[PDB]
C-alpha cells in the first residue's frame, strides 16, 4: 500500500518505511506528525474521494533538519556594469513514514 501525501504545497508518493525531504516543519527531532492525503491505493482500490480521504492521515516521524544545495546567483546584464551576487540554502525536514 502507498499514499499520495500533501505537505509544503507539494505532493509526494510514499509508503510505510520511506524517507522524504519536505519543506521545513515547525517540529523538533523525533516526534510525530500527521499529514493529509490525496489518494490511497490499498492494492486494487484507490479511495478516490475527498469525504473518505479527509479521515485518512499518514503518520510521520521527523528525522532532522537538513539543508538544500547551495545556490550561487550572479545576475548580469550585457553592457551596463550591473552585477548582483546572492547565495541561498533551503531549509528542509526529513520525514520517515510510519502510518498510512
Interface residues toward other proteins, by CB under 8 A: 4, 10-13, 38-39, 41, 44-46, 48-50, 71-76
**Shortest Å distance, C-beta 66 to other proteins:** 17
| Half-sphere exposure in the Cβ direction for 65 (13 Å, CA) | 11
Based on the shown chain and the rule CB under 7 A, indicate whether residue 17 belongs to the binding site for RNA: no
Based on the shown chain and the rule CB under 7 A, indicate whether residue 8 belongs to the binding site for RNA: yes
Based on the shown chain and the rule CB under 7 A, indicate whether residue 84 belongs to the binding site for RNA: yes
Binding residues for RNA, rule: CB under 7 A, are 8-11, 23-24, 67-68, 70-73, 75, 77-82, 84-91
Amino acid at each position: 500500500t502507498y499514499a499520495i501525501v500533501k505537505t509544503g504545497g507539494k505532493q509526494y508518493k510514499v509508503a510505510v518505511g520511506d524517507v522524504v525531504k519536505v519543506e521545513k516543519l515547525e517540529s523538533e527531532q523525533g516526534e510525530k506528525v500527521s499529514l493529509p492525503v490525496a489518494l490511497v491505493v490499498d492494492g486494487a482500490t484507490v479511495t478516490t474521494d475527498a469525504k473518505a480521504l479527509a479521515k485518512v492521515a499518514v503518520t510521520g516521524e521527523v528525522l532532522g533538519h537538513t539543508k538544500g544545495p547551495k545556490i550561487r546567483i550572479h545576475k548580469f546584464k550585457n553592457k551596463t556594469g550591473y552585477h548582483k551576487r546572492q547565495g541561498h540554502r533551503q531549509q528542509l525536514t526529513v520525514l520517515k513514514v510510519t502510518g498510512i
